[PDB]
Amino acid sequence: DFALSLLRRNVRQVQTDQGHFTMLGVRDRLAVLPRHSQPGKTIWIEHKLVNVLDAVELVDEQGVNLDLTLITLDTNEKFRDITKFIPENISTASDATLVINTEHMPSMFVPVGDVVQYGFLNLSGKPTHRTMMYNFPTKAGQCGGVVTSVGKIIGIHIGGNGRQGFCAGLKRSYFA
Numbered sequence: 001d002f003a004l005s006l007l008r009r010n011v012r013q014v015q016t017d018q019g020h021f022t023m024l025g026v027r028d029r030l031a032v033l034p035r036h037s038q039p040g041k042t043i044w045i046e047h048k049l050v051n052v053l054d055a056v057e058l059v060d061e062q063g064v065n066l067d068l069t070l071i072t073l074d075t076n077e078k079f080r081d082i083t084k085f086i087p088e089n090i091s092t093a094s095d096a097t098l099v100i101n102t103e104h105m106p107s108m109f110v111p112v113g114d115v116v117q118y119g120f121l122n123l124s125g126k127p128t129h130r131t132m133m134y135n136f137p138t139k140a141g142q143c144g145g146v147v148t149s150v151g152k153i154i155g156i157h158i159g160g161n162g163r164q165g166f167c168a169g170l171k172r173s174y175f176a
């Protein structure tokens with residue numbers, strides 16, 4: 001129920017020069033993407049070209065790569081504010097669902113099971129922190145996917161090795 005309404009109201013198909021991604025709209029004109037999507041000044045959102053007002057790579061007190069980029073979109077439409085569904089602290093989970101929505105992989109829900117603390121992750125040679133892991137064969141095209149569990153939004157899909165998948169953890173304070 002919660003995953004379905006999240007998909008409808010907040011999860012959008014996008015394309016950058018790096019390919020297809022799922023984008024989570026967070027509130028108003030603010031949305032989050034995996035860093036490796038490398039959004040430019042213009043982004044493709046559901047068959048429309050959209051101006052990107054600002055893009056900031058997510059940094060926390062530690063000053064390390066979290067593999068997320070916050071963008072502000074030049075749009076009329078305002079995302080439903082879902083920050084209250086993002087935990088105040090990075091949260092592991094059981095019975096999690098990955099919500100993917102791109103032009104090539106539209107509106108798909110994947111039960112990934114337990115989402116456990118993982119932390120540091122070397123993603124194709126690039127150091128990444130505060131990740132969590134699920135034992136599910138995620139694949140190319142699923143980055144940006146939104147990890148959800150029991151009414152909470154807990155991560156964004158960023159990588160996998162064919163047998164396991166990994167997400168960047170989400171905390172409410174990222175979007176304050």
Ligand SMILES: CCOC(=O)CC[C@H](C[C@@H]1CCNC1=O)NC(=O)[C@@H](CC(=O)[C@@H](NC(=O)c1cc(C)on1)C(C)C)Cc1ccc(F)cc1
Nearest residue numbers: 036122123124126138139140141142143158159160161162
């Ligand atoms: C161009 C296509 O891009 C996409 O489709 C983005 C979505 C995917 C989905 C992967 C695609 C596959 N199974 C998955 O779940 N992500 C990646 O491909 C990335 C890297 C991998 O996952 C690497 N995995 C690990 O390093 C890795 C380490 C451990 C441990 O587990 N995986 C590759 C070796 C697959 C892209 C990337 C490159 C440089 C970075 F700075 C950061 C990220």
